[PDB]
Every structure is written in C-alpha cells, then in structure tokens.
Enzyme design. Structure first.
Site: not given
Ligand code: NAP
Ligand code: ZST
Length: 315
Positions: A43, A48, A77, A110
């Site tokens: 992903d 990023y 995204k 996104h």
């Molecule tokens: N669509 C969007 O708006 C959106 C928003 C947020 C996230 N996402 C995607 O979803 C992914 C996952 O969410 P996230 O990055 O927010 O956080 P997450 O996966 O919930 O948590 C990642 C954190 O947990 C740690 N971690 C991972 N495996 C672990 C384990 N087995 N034991 C202890 N700690 C562990 C990592 O540390 P280390 O990396 O230091 O090991 C990092 O600090 C993102 O990276 C991104 O690809 C999408």
């Molecule tokens: O984007 C990621 O994947 C992780 C992500 N999340 N957020 C919190 C956010 N909250 C939002 C809320 C809106 C809103 F739609 F709600 F207006 C729009 C956009 C965003 S960004 C961040 O601020 C961010 C900054 C840099 C890289 C990744 C991220």
C-alpha cells in the site's frame, strides 16, 4: 483464503504492507524483506514521499526472479491537490514512474477533499485552515475512470469516504466503474460497524488502515489510547501464544476486511505476516468489537471546514 475477489474480477491479497512513515532510508529494505517472507500487496501513496524507494525494491525482486509482476498487488492514491480533472492522469503517471511500474492494481482517491493545486501537499492559509479547491467528488471519480479505460490502473476505489459520499458515486448517472474498495481507518477503538455493513452490502471491499493504532503517527499525545499496549488485548494475545500485533491484524481478517499493517523493522514485518496459522474465537471477536470508542488516528483538524470533510456524518 488469502485473497478477496474484487468487482473487476481480480483477486486482492487480504494482508498487505503499509508504507506511510516508512523513511526512504529504510523502506527499500522493508519491501524487499516483505516480499521475501510472502507479502504480495503493498500500500503506497504519492503523499508518503517514498514511492521511488518502494519502486527500487519491487524492481530488484523482479530482477532477482523472486516474484513476477502479476503476483504483486500494488496500490497507490491520488493526493488531494490533484483532484482537478486535468491533473489526475499526470498524478497517476508520476506514481507509476516513481514505482517503476506500467500499471497499478488499484488506485484510490486518497481523501474526498480537494486542496488548492500546487507543490505544497497541505496548503494552509495564514490562520491555519486548509485551502480547498473547487473540485467535486464526481468529477474526480470520472477522471479516475479514465485511467482504467487507458490501462494505467486495473481498479479504482476511494478512501476516507463516508457512506453518503460513496453513495454519491454509486448513484452517478453514467457511472462507468463502481468503486472496488473503500480504505478506511479501522481497529478495536474505531470499529466502523455501520460503514463496513454499508460497504459490504454494496459489494465494495473494505481495507482497514492503521490496524495497530498508528503509534508512530506524528500528532500522538501521551494521553492517547494505545492499542498495542492495551492489557486487555495483550491477554487475548497471550491465550493464543501470539503477539498483540498479530491479534490486531487477525481481527479485521475475520471481518472479511483487507488489512495493511506498516513496519520497517524486519522482525516485525515477518511477525506480522504470521497470522494465517491461528483463529480468534467468537468471544475474542465480540470482546475486541466492544472496545470501540470512535477514536480516530487520522483526522486533521485544519480540514474540518472543508465542504467535503467526511467525518461530520455519523458514518
Ligand atoms: N488511506 C489513508 O488515508 C491512510 C491513512 C493512514 C494509514 N494508511 C495506510 O495504512 C498503513 C498502516 O497504518 P499506519 O502506518 O498508520 O499504522 P499501523 O500499521 O497501525 O502502525 C504502524 C506502527 O506500528 C509499529 N509496528 C508494526 N508492527 C509492529 C509489531 N509487530 N509490534 C510492535 N509495533 C509494530 C510500527 O513500527 P516500525 O515501522 O518502526 O516497526 C509503526 O510505528 C499505512 O502505513 C498506510 O499504508 C492509509
Ligand atoms: O493520508 C494518509 O494516508 C496518512 C496521513 N494522514 N494525515 C492525517 C490527515 N487527515 C486528513 C483529513 C482530510 C479530510 F478529508 F478529512 F478533510 C484530508 C486529508 C487528511 S491527511 C496527515 O496529516 C498526513 C500527512 C502526511 C502524510 C500522510 C498523512
């Protein structure tokens, strides 16, 4: 099963690797290790700032003959500053260029909110508010559809869309492609029961992000709830001789969700994949759903006035 069928006939691995906050200095090795221990779904996102380095790792493992492209499921995204129709193809092609790919398996809007076009990914005015753009969800969707028809992406979807926003798309006159996926925050403190029900009843696959509660999120406050440190979940993990993270990853898999835990630590990348050898009980599942507090890791306060802000609605 390890993959879920999308509306376009393609199969999506239910476990993928997250890359937000993975620094370029370490994400190449993360992805290489990931592919070596069995991940096939990664992903990504332009916002990023590490797609080149993800691309380096994929390219090297193709060359090493470890995997073939068809075996990988790569997601990116469209960032908020590119919602204008005339900017979408360019944004997609930048991502493909950086990832050194000729197609993406899935490309998501996104966030439903468009931001002022420009180099700055988070354009703010002088008082802290995000500067919106005069774009709307359906025009942006139409431009994403074009990418399918040009073959740059195999499927399109959305992310952080509330159910009214999803329905806007579904009910678009002359819709060409239904969204395949809605990727949303989901974990025991934000269980998303109603939006998951809505999406699954519409044949839209849900991907759960921040399944471990994103402890590395940059705005974390000491007083915030901590999923990986919750003693209640630790006790569920102990019972199964698994770690808390493995429980947190397994939980959405048993809800017919896709899940994308992030790590750059090789031991954890491996640990996190070892979730196909145990089952959470009916009582485990019930218990974990009971921890819901409607607590969001991801919800920038500077965006709360945007016309399309998704989280005013109940779901
Ligand atoms: N669509 C969007 O708006 C959106 C928003 C947020 C996230 N996402 C995607 O979803 C992914 C996952 O969410 P996230 O990055 O927010 O956080 P997450 O996966 O919930 O948590 C990642 C954190 O947990 C740690 N971690 C991972 N495996 C672990 C384990 N087995 N034991 C202890 N700690 C562990 C990592 O540390 P280390 O990396 O230091 O090991 C990092 O600090 C993102 O990276 C991104 O690809 C999408
Ligand atoms: O984007 C990621 O994947 C992780 C992500 N999340 N957020 C919190 C956010 N909250 C939002 C809320 C809106 C809103 F739609 F709600 F207006 C729009 C956009 C965003 S960004 C961040 O601020 C961010 C900054 C840099 C890289 C990744 C991220």
């Amino acid at each position: 099963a390890s993959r879920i069928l999308l509306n376009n006939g393609a199969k999506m691995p239910i476990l993928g690797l997250g890359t937000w906050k993975s620094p370029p200095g370490q994400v190449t090795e993360a992805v290489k290790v990931a592919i070596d221990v069995g991940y096939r779904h990664i992903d990504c996102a332009h916002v990023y700032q590490n797609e080149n380095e993800v691309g380096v790792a994929i390219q090297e493992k193709l060359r090493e003959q470890v995997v073939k492209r068809e075996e990988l499921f790569i997601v990116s995204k469209l960032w908020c500053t590119y919602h204008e129709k005339g900017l979408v193809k360019g944004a997609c092609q930048k991502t493909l260029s950086d990832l050194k790919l000729d197609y993406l398996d899935l490309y998501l809007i996104h966030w439903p909110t468009g931001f002022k076009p420009g180099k700055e990914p988070f354009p703010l005015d002088e008082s802290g508010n995000v500067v919106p753009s005069d774009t709307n969800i359906l025009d942006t969707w139409a431009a994403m559809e074009e990418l399918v028809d040009e073959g740059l992406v195999k499927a399109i979807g959305i992310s952080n869309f509330n159910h009214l926003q999803v329905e806007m798309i579904l009910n678009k006159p002359g819709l060409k492609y239904k969204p395949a996926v809605n990727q949303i925050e989901c974990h025991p403190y934000l269980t998303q029961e109603k939006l998951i029900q809505y999406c699954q009843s519409k044949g839209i696959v849900v991907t759960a992000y921040s399944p471990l509660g994103s402890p590395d999120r940059p705005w974390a406050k000491p007083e915030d709830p901590s999923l990986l440190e919750d003693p209640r979940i630790k006790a569920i993990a102990a019972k199964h001789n698994k770690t808390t993270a493995q429980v947190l990853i397994r939980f959405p898999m048993q809800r017919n969700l896709v899940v994308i835990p992030k790590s750059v630590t090789p031991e954890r990348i491996a640990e996190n994949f070892k979730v196909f050898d145990f089952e959470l009980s009916s009582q485990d599942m019930t218990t974990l759903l009971s921890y819901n507090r409607n607590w969001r890791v991801c919800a920038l306060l500077s965006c709360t006035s945007h016309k399309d802000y998704p989280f005013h609605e109940e779901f």
